[PDB]
Amino acid sequence: QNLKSTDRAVQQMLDKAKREGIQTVWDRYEAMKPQCGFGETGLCCRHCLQGPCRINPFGDEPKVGICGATAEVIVARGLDRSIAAGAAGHSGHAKHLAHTLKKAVQGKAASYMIKDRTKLHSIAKRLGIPTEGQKDEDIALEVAKAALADFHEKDTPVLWVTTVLPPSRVKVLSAHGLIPAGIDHEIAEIMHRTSMGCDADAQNLLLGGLRCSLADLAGCYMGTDLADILFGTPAPVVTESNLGVLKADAVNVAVHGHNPVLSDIIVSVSKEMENEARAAGATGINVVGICCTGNEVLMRHGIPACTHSVSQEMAMITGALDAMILDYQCIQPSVATIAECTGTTVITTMEMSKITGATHVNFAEEAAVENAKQILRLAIDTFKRRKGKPVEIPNIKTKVVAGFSTEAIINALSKLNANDPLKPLIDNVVNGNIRGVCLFAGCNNVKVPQDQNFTTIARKLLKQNVLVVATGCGAGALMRHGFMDPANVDELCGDGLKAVLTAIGEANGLGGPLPPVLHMGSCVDNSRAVALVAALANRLGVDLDRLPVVASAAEAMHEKAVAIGTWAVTIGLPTHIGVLPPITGSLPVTQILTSSVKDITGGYFIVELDPETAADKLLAAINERRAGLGLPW
Amino acid sequence: QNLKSTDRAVQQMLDKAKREGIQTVWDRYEAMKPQCGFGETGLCCRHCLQGPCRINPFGDEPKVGICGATAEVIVARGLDRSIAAGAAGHSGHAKHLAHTLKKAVQGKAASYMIKDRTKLHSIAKRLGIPTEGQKDEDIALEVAKAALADFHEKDTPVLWVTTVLPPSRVKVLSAHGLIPAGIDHEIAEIMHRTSMGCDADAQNLLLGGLRCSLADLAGCYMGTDLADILFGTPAPVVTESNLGVLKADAVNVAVHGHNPVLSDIIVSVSKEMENEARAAGATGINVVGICCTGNEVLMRHGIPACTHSVSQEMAMITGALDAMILDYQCIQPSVATIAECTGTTVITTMEMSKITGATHVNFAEEAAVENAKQILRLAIDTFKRRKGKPVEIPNIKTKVVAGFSTEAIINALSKLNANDPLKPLIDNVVNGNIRGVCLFAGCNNVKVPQDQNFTTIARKLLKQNVLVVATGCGAGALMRHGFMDPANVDELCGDGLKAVLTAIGEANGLGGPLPPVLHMGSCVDNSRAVALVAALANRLGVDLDRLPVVASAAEAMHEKAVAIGTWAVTIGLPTHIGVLPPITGSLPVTQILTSSVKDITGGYFIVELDPETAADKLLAAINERRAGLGLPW
């Protein structure tokens, strides 16, 4: 089982699933091998009913699509559609939060409110919305209106791009025509240009993809901004992760998906129903997180994280998961059938994301509290049905310090330099105590033993004094393996990094260091890393493609991760991807994305499936940036 | 060669291509066989980097996707993405016309203007825009603003749906949640819900697809409305079709693609440059049409149609095509390489639709006349380069009467009943002289001998007194085979239909009948058929699912054709498709789309690859509607 997952709690549940005859994601993968090499390499097109068209990577015919589409065109069109799909998910999440904020301040959804007034005002100022002499509800209405306006063409480009990157970066992107005109506008233009008989030049197609990736970045940044207004900006918090956070004697409720609009309410309502849970024979309601919705409530409320991504079915296999409350994205639909075997009540809540066989509850912000109570009462009923049934919860969990929003990181740094908070970080980059910064992002992927790339690369970088930040299921992997526990700083961290983590932590009262890796939140919260990196660029007076900052989607899976990796490149970062994207069937496309894009945006992909080698390549990229700034390395 | 195309001019060019060693679409198809059966049946998914996933139609594993996605989910998600891609193309075309109209009336593009003031005012009235006491330029600015607003969420749904279908039809659709909220909004929501780990219920997915198909209908209707304002509403016109419309002694310029924003200008400017062409040794500039842009200028100006769809390369093979001027959609990118062998200058004009190896001219409405002259001078230079080179233009052409906009059809009917123009048509439906109405739409497809399904089905329906209307490359096929020549009425038409076509034609001064088939224009102009059918529904006081009206995408290819067929079903029509869409891998999906959707919208797909059988099934559908109205059949 260690060939499937490096997480020992997951291995234990894989053994239980095996002896119980419950098919898992790893079994479904095995049943799919050998997978189609045309699709793997990107050399398949189904964009019209003359297809499917495939192209042999090497050899004889077929060499070209039926309509004349070359391998370069087919590869670029497929990649573009994946970027647009990722943009559609992150920006759909953001759009749903914009409507929630609007309803809240119009008096239509009293369960929601402006919780972070400071963030509201700072966002308004960044957008150019006047605040002097205005009521908060009116400022927030204007912010929500501006958020919705960025989805379509108007007299300004997408402000959640142009107002969040330094002017010099916007200028570079504008010169290449890469600034998006509207989020949904770009998604639709991708779908058009990639349809049959339209765009058929690889460079033109890929420039379109870069622009659509910035629409994804805008959706990410808008989602973080709106969730922080509504639910609070994260600050440091201590909690736990892995399956051992489930409790046999409690009602265990997983919140799973991405948009916390309802699960933030689940968290507060669950505390009100504790006596109702006790009357049912439980100790209380134990809300736990899966995937990004779990990250959201972990960052804001310290809700413990049960599991992530590829191993999500294993929470059910314990027998103790009474409910799994779903919104959208990254939910294996297998959960609906597995629930028949495990007793879990799987509940969907969003109209556009249903699963055959799950119970649907039509969540509405206007009825959020009542919807939550209905859902939690189903979970309570399920707990009662398992009275006397043995469960197998692996007694495996790690300590997690998280909550490192960009505001929290700046505030922590300010304890070392109150009026120039970024300077202590830059000082330590310059003197070599911090070699550079690496953001781990993205998913797990069944093709890679779970977490093996994240942990292998992270260990090498930390020993070489890299400041490591993480989001989404990259944060999930690292938290489950102890990388967010300050007690592991001595084992994991180079001496220089250890010294910095210790100085900051002690200056913040912790009596110990910051953790080895800083959790910056959910996948939309990759935008927080952008805010941090853009703030460093501004403080130094250089563009992002001169900073010693890299990204790694070390185990990527979702179309969203493709979009994120693409915008990381577009804003100027060397960006590693540790699974093969469907590009290798076209050398010209691969060369653009890994080499000639450097001349456009200064960023570039690093495709490397071997994690030791990937770590070496990421260090080389960091060190090349250091040398370009005249620094030792 | 008759196994490839039933068009004799195409067969002649296929022989020339063969002996010259020029690879064609049919050769590329042969080189692709056998095609992948997983893709053919819809049982392939590449929506995440754990894929590709495939499912065996029958037999053993794989039976399910790696994430747990069933065959029903995979099939429905793929189909939804095709609908969204089609919507993105038609609505991108409409959006581009909306911006053109806005620029025209703001004084920013003097080559464009309000040409159809009556249509402008009628559209404004239908949208609720006041006209009394307003300048035309202000009414048109409001119409353009309303068009752009339908792309995003606002306080009203998509008006180019809700204002163009009868209230009873809107009510049915609203009750099922099918009215789109915004065109690009729905496209993006499709992309989100179909991404990994989101919507996973076939019925829910397909309802989303139906709603997105109505966003496509809105884009189609908006495109027709705006093109009619800008360029004139079609009226009956006489011209010719097929390769014989090329002239060796002229500069032959094909306009190819879909959006006539520039090619309508090409048409007028070409007439100004006739002396410049004569100074180069030509008789003049002979503008000819390919595909839908050709349909647009045929309908409005009688520009002869050279060829369509699958056979587009054959125009080049003549050796006499001096330029091919491209916008977007349905252009085989092979044209760029074939041009090296044939001498044709292939020119792209739209930023999001380039082809490696073609010359790009950056068309801007503000510079439309100058851009046109630059393009036409390249064509003139190319004509000069072929002085003394033999060409082979098949001496094959048909007479084409076209221009049957819905306004033109109503006006023609009004000569038989001035104040109740639809009544003569309804009278003849009731007495059986007109059995019903069939719209032929969509593309050719290399899998089907070119035009064989269109002509086989049309012949059977016409003998059975069906009024046949046609658009896009369905109109193209029928025009190239003589179905738009009134001289063929006696051979093709049943006695009842002949009597009606003759009465209308003679009442309109023609001294002869209307043609056997009425050309209603380009693919967006399928919206004109909707206008006609909705007007008949309103006049009869019934919904569209009670009318004896059917549609046939007899040789469909493009994602756009999937979207059109889906909205035809959604508005209530029995809708034949004569190529296999990628649905047969899921019986539950197939049953929804061909049977249980009847209970939702009253329409339904009829999948039938054999054209004789398809004609029988379409007649049965028409006759079932007749019986439901109490009529003999």
Ligand code: SF4
């Ligand atoms: S768009 Fe071209 S390559 Fe793709 S399926 Fe259609 S014919 Fe084949």
Ligand code: SF4
């Ligand atoms: S979304 Fe599911 S079915 Fe599709 S490729 Fe990914 S794992 Fe396979």
Ligand code: FES
């Ligand atoms: S041929 Fe396998 S992905 Fe299309």
Ligand code: FES
């Ligand atoms: S396996 Fe052939 S289309 Fe994917």
Ligand SMILES: [Fe+2]
């Ligand atoms: Fe996520």
Ligand SMILES: [Fe+2]
């Ligand atoms: Fe077309």
Ligand SMILES: [Fe+3]
């Ligand atoms: Fe996840």
Ligand SMILES: [Fe+3]
């Ligand atoms: Fe995910």
Ligand SMILES: [Fe+3]
């Ligand atoms: Fe992910």
Ligand SMILES: [Fe+3]
């Ligand atoms: Fe994730």
Ligand SMILES: [Fe+3]
């Ligand atoms: Fe993610």
Ligand SMILES: [Fe+3]
């Ligand atoms: Fe066409």
Ligand SMILES: [Fe+3]
């Ligand atoms: Fe077409």
Ligand SMILES: [Fe+3]
């Ligand atoms: Fe077509």
Ligand SMILES: [Fe+3]
């Ligand atoms: Fe066509």
Ligand SMILES: [Fe+3]
């Ligand atoms: Fe078409």
